[PDB]
Design a protein around this ligand. Structure first.
Ligand SMILES: Nc1ncnc2c1ncn2[C@@H]1O[C@H](COP(=O)(O)OP(=O)(O)OP(=O)(O)O)[C@@H](O)[C@H]1O
Lengths: 71, 834
RNA sequence: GUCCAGCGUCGCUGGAC
C-alpha cells in the first residue's frame, strides 16, 4: 500500500492509488545491483509520502500553491 | 581550475592560455585538422552571438603554428575594402610568405629557378582577374584566350581561375615545404552582407586537398543570407502575378529545400563544432560540472580563495533583488547562466567593480544600472521608459502594466518571473524586478503604492474589463486613460477610479456588496424593521470620524452613489507615511475626496468640542509616524513579495463579498452569530484580510529573516471567523519567544500595519463581534495578543464588556455603521436557527 | 462519533475531544 499510495494537492488534498505507482516501484528497485545493505536503503526510499502540484494549465494552480503542501 | 580576474582588460584578444575557457575543445579540434590532412575539408566552428567566436579561432591558429601545416593570418571580410574580392586578399597573403621564405632562404640558386616559376603563375592570375570584376562580356578577350599552353597540363581549356589558382597553391606548398595550407575566416555578425562573397569564393576556388578552411559564424544568420539570394532567382513579374496561397506554398518549399542542399554541401555536418555555454560547463544546481570556473572580485583577493562562478552571481542576485535563500532566487541565476558569455561577464564586471569602489550604498542601484546598460536593446522593443531622470513611481507602475500586456497573462504577470518563452520578455523581466527593489527599499509609503497601483491595475482589468483583436487593445488604451496611470497622482485618487470601475457591473439581485466595497444608502427607506436607518455621518467622534472620512468615496453618475471602499484606507495610510512631518498631510489626507472629487462612470458603461477632540486623534497619528521612522529603515521588499501579497489579498476579498452577500437579515443588528452579517462585519473582515495577508508571507518571502515561523499546516484565510488569523498569531508567538527574536526585527511590515491608528476602530466594531460560548474564547485571546504586540491597550475594561454582551462615548470604535442600510437588500427574510 | 472552520459548485478538506 505504501508503495502504491500517492497524493495530489489541487483544491483539497486528494489521495490516489494508481497501478502506475507499482510500475514505478519495480523500476526503481530493479536497478539496484547492490548487496543487502543498500536494499534496506532503497526499499525504504521507495515507500514514502509524495505530494505533487497540479500542472500549470489547470484552473486551480494558483489556489493549490497558495494553500501550501502540508498536513 | 580556471581563474578569471574582473580587473583585467577583458578584451576579446586579451585572453591568454590561463584565461581561456574551452581548453578541452581547442585540442579536440586541432587533432581533427591534423588527422584529416594525414589521410571538401571545410570546418565550421559554430557559436552563438557573443560567445568567444574570435578568441577561440586565435587559440586554434596559435596551437597549429607552434605533417606540416602553414597557417595563413586570420582574415575577416567585414574589415576589408567593399569591392575587393576574397581571392585577391588570399593571394596577397600567400605572396608575403613565399617571398619572405625565398629572400630569407638565400641558399645556392634555388631562388632563381623557383622565383621565375612563382612569378610566372602570378602573371597568369593577374591576366585572368578581369573575369571577376566585369559588368559585361568584352569580346576582344576571345582572341586573348585560346593561346593554349602545355604548361601544367590543364585538365580543361579556358581562362578558368580555379585551375590557375590551384597550381599556384601547389607551387607554394613545395617552396614552403608544408603538407597543406590553412585558411581561417571570421564571423560576419556586424555586417553579414559581406558573407556572400566568402561563400562564393569557398565553393569555387577552395576545393583542393592542400587547403583547409576554418569558418566562423552563426547558421541562424547564414541561412537568411542564402535564402535571400534564392528569391532573387525567381522572375519578379512572376512573383507579383501568381499570388495565390496555393502557389505561395509551392514556391515556399522549393526554397527552404534549396538552401539546405547548399549548406549540407558546403559545411558538412560531420565537421561542425558547437561551442559550450556557461550552463553546460558549470552544471545545474548540485549536478557535477564538466569543468571548474572561479572568479576574483577584488585586486587584493588570493587565488586560493576565489569563489565559484555560480556563487558570484548568486550573491549578486540575492541581495541585488533582495531575495531570500530559496528556489525562486535560484531561478533568476539559472537564467543568467544561459546569457551570452560577453554579456554575462560585462554585467558581473560592472557590478563588482562599482561595488568595490563604493566601499573604497544601495546595492540594488548598482545592479539596476548594470542591467540597464546591458539589456538596453530589449527595453526599446518592450517600450519601457529609457530616460534616467524620469525613473520614478508612476513610470515604474507603467512598466509593470505594459510588461503584463505584452506577456498576456494577468494572473501571475506581476510576479515578474522570467518564464516567458520569448527572449525579450525574459530579458526585460529581470531588469524590472531590480527596479522594484530599488524604489520600494527602505520606505513603507512606496511599498503600499506598488501593491495597490502596480498590481491592483492588472487584476481589476482582468475581471471587470475583459469579460476581436482590435477591440481588446481599444479597451486597454481606454482603460489606461481612465485610471490615469502614468500621471503623478496620489494613491487615494486612484482608489476612487478603482471604485468606479468595479461598481458598474451589477451582481445577482443587485446587492450593494462588491469586491472590498459596500454601497451605502443616500435616500430614506420606508418601513425598515429594527434600528436600521440611514448612515448618519455626524454621529462619530475623534479617531473614528477621520477613519470613516478617509474611507468614504462618491461617484456622481446618474444618481449620487456612496461607498465605503477599503481601498481608500490603504491609499490614505500611504499618504500619511509619505510626508511624515509638518502636521499638514494628516490635516489634508483626512479631507481629500469627501466634497471635491466628482467621478464619472467609464465611457464603456451602459447605464464634545470639535477642537478638543480632533487634535487628540491627530496626536496619536504623529506618535505612530514617529515609530515608523526608526524601524522602516530595515524594509527590504522584493518583486516576489509584493506580487504574492496582492494574490492572497485579492483572493480573500472575493470570497468575503461572496459569502456575506446573502447573509443579510432583518434582525442582523449587532450581529453576534457567524450566520448573521451586517455592514460593520463586512468592513471588519475587509481590513482583517489585508492585515492577514501580510502576516502569512512576511515570514515566507522577506529577506531580513532566513527562515519562517508559521510552522506546518494549511494556509487558510479568515472569511467568517478569526480562528485562522489567531492561530497563526499564537504559533509564531512562542516560536519568536522560545528563540529570542523580537517582532520588530523579524516582521517589520506587520508590526507597522498593526499599530496604525486609522485601522484600530475598524478591527473591533460594534456589530462585528462573534458572541458565542466557544467563539468568545478565541476573540478574547485575539484581543490579548494584539495588545501585547502593539504595547498600547486599545480597549479598556468597560468598553470591551460593553461590546461583548450586546451610550458610552467611543473614540476608537465605529458605532453606527452596522445600523446603516445597504442598497438592494430590502431585509425581508430572517436569520435561521438550527 | 460530535462540534467549529476552510476549498470548489451538494461534494471535498483541515482542526479539536
Ligand atoms: N576564453 C574566454 N575567457 C573569458 N572571456 C572570454 C573568452 N572568450 C571570449 N570571452 C569574452 O567574450 C568577449 C567577446 O568575445 P568574442 O569577441 O569572441 O565574440 P563576438 O563579439 O560575438 O565576436 P567577434 O568579435 O568575432 O564579432 C570578450 O570581451 C570576453 O569578455
Amino acid at each position: 500500500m505504501a508503495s502504491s499510495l500517492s497524493t495530489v494537492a489541487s483544491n483539497n488534498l486528494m489521495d490516489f492509488c494508481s497501478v502506475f505507482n507499482l510500475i514505478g516501484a519495480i523500476a526503481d528497485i530493479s536497478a539496484c545491483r547492490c548487496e543487502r545493505s543498500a536494499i534496506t536503503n532503497a526499499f525504504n526510499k521507495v515507500i514514502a509520502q509524495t505530494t505533487c502540484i497540479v500542472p500549470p494549465w489547470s484552473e486551480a494552480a494558483v489556489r493549490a500553491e497558495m494553500k501550501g503542501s502540508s498536513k | 581550475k580556471i581563474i578569471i580576474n574582473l580587473f583585467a582588460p577583458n578584451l576579446p584578444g586579451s585572453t591568454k592560455e590561463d584565461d581561456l575557457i574551452q581548453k578541452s575543445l581547442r585540442d579536440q579540434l586541432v587533432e581533427s585538422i591534423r588527422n584529416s590532412i594525414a589521410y571538401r575539408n571545410v570546418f565550421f566552428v559554430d557559436g552563438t552571438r557573443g560567445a568567444g567566436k574570435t578568441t577561440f579561432i586565435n587559440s586554434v591558429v596559435k596551437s597549429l603554428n607552434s605533417v606540416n601545416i602553414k597557417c595563413l593570418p586570420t582574415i575577416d571580410p567585414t574589415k576589408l575594402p567593399r569591392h575587393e574580392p576574397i581571392l585577391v586578399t588570399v593571394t596577397a597573403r600567400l605572396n608575403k610568405m613565399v617571398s619572405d621564405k625565398l629572400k630569407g632562404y638565400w641558399a645556392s640558386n634555388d631562388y632563381r629557378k623557383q622565383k621565375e616559376q612563382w612569378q610566372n603563375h602570378l602573371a597568369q592570375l593577374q591576366r585572368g582577374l578581369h573575369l571577376l570584376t566585369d559588368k559585361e562580356y568584352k569580346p576582344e578577350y576571345f582572341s586573348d584566350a585560346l593561346k593554349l599552353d602545355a604548361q601544367l597540363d590543364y585538365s580543361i581549356g579556358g581562362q578558368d581561375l580555379s585551375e590557375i589558382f590551384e597550381e599556384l597553391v601547389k607551387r607554394a606548398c613545395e617552396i614552403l615545404d608544408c603538407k597543406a595550407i590553412l585558411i581561417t575566416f571570421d564571423d560576419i555578425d556586424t555586417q553579414f552582407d559581406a558573407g556572400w562573397d566568402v561563400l562564393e569564393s569557398i565553393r569555387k576556388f577552395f576545393n583542393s586537398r592542400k587547403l583547409v578552411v576554418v569558418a566562423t559564424g552563426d547558421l541562424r544568420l547564414y541561412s537568411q543570407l542564402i535564402r535571400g539570394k534564392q528569391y532573387e532567382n525567381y522572375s519578379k513579374t512572376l512573383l507579383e502575378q501568381e499570388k495565390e496561397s496555393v502557389r505561395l506554398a509551392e514556391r515556399g518549399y522549393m526554397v527552404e529545400h534549396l538552401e539546405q542542399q547548399y549548406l549540407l554541401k558546403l559545411f558538412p555536418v560531420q565537421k561542425r563544432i558547437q561551442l559550450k555555454t556557461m550552463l553546460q560547463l558549470v552544471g545545474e544546481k548540485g549536478k557535477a560540472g564538466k569543468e571548474e570556473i572561479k572568479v576574483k572580485t577584488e585586486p587584493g583577493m588570493q587565488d586560493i580563495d576565489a569563489i565559484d562562478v555560480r556563487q558570484a552571481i548568486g550573491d549578486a542576485v540575492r541581495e541585488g533583488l533582495n531575495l531570500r535563500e530559496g528556489s525562486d532566487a535560484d531561478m533568476y541565476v539559472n537564467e543568467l547562466l544561459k546569457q551570452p558569455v560577453r554579456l554575462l561577464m560585462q554585467v558581473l564586471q560592472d557590478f563588482y567593480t562599482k561595488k568595490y569602489h563604493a566601499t573604497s550604498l544601495s546595492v540594488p542601484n548598482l545592479l539596476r544600472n548594470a542591467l540597464y546598460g546591458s539589456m538596453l536593446s530589449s527595453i526599446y522593443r518592450a517600450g519601457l521608459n529609457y530616460e534616467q531622470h524620469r525613473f520614478g513611481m508612476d513610470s515604474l507602475c507603467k512598466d509593470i502594466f505594459t510588461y503584463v500586456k505584452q506577456d498576456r497573462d494577468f494572473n501571475t504577470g506581476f510576479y515578474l518571473r522570467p518564464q516567458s518563452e520569448s527572449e525579450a520578455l525574459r530579458n526585460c523581466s529581470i531588469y524590472l524586478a531590480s527596479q522594484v527593489s530599488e524604489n520600494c527599499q527602505g520606505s513603507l509609503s512606496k511599498f503600499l503604492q506598488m501593491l495597490l497601483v502596480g498590481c491592483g491595475s492588472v487584476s481589476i482589468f482582468n475581471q471587470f474589463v475583459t469579460e476581436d483583436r482590435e477591440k481588446f487593445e481599444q479597451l486597454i488604451s481606454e482603460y489606461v486613460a481612465y485610471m490615469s496611470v502614468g500621471r503623478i497622482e496620489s494613491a487615494s485618487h486612484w482608489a476612487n477610479r478603482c471604485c468606479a470601475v468595479v461598481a458598474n457591473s451589477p451582481n445577482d439581485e443587485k446587492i450593494g456588496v462588491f469586491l472590498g466595497m459596500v454601497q451605502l444608502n443616500r435616500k430614506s427607506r420606508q418601513h425598515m424593521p429594527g434600528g436600521y436607518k440611514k448612515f448618519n455621518i455626524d454621529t462619530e467622534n475623534g479617531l473614528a470620524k477621520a477613519a470613516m472620512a478617509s474611507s468614504l468615496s462618491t461617484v456622481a453618475s446618474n444618481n449620487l452613489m456612496d461607498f465605503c471602499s477599503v481601498f481608500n484606507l490603504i491609499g490614505a495610510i500611504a499618504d500619511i507615511s509619505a510626508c511624515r512631518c509638518e502636521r499638514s498631510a494628516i490635516t489634508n489626507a483626512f479631507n481629500k475626496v469627501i466634497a471635491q472629487t466628482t467621478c464619472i462612470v467609464p465611457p464603456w458603461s451602459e447605464a464634545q468640542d470639535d477642537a478638543t477632540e480632533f487634535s487628540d486623534a491627530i496626536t496619536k497619528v504623529e506618535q505612530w509616524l514617529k515609530n515608523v521612522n526608526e524601524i522602516e529603515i530595515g524594509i527590504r521588499p522584493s518583486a516576489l513579495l509584493i506580487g504574492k501579497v496582492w494574490s492572497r489579498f485579492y483572493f480573500n476579498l472575493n470570497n468575503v463579498a461572496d459569502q456575506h452577500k446573502t447573509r443579510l437579515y432583518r434582525n442582523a443588528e449587532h450581529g453576534r452569530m457567524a450566520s448573521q452579517s451586517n455592514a460593520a462585519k463586512i468592513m471588519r473582515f475587509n481590513v482583517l484580510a489585508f492585515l492577514h495577508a501580510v502576516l502569512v508571507e512576511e515570514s515566507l518571502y522577506h529577506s531580513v529573516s532566513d527562515r519562517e515561523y508559521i510552522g506546518e499546516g494549511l494556509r487558510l484565510n479568515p472569511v467568517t471567523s478569526v480562528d485562522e488569523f489567531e492561530k497563526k498569531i499564537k504559533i509564531i508567538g512562542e516560536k519568536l519567544k522560545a528563540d529570542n527574536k523580537t517582532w520588530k526585527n523579524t516582521h517589520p511590515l506587520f508590526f507597522l500595519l498593526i499599530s496604525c491608528p486609522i485601522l484600530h476602530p475598524f478591527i473591533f466594531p460594534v456589530g462585528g463581534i462573534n458572541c458565542s460560548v466557544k467563539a468568545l474564547n478565541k476573540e478574547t485571546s485575539f484581543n490579548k495578543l494584539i495588545d501585547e504586540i502593539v504595547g498600547d491597550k486599545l480597549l479598556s475594561d468597560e468598553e470591551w464588556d460593553y461590546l461583548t454582551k450586546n451610550q458610552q462615548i467611543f473614540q476608537n470604535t465605529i458605532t453606527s455603521l452596522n445600523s446603516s442600510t445597504i442598497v438592494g437588500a430590502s431585509y425581508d427574510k430572517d436569520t435561521p436557527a438550527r
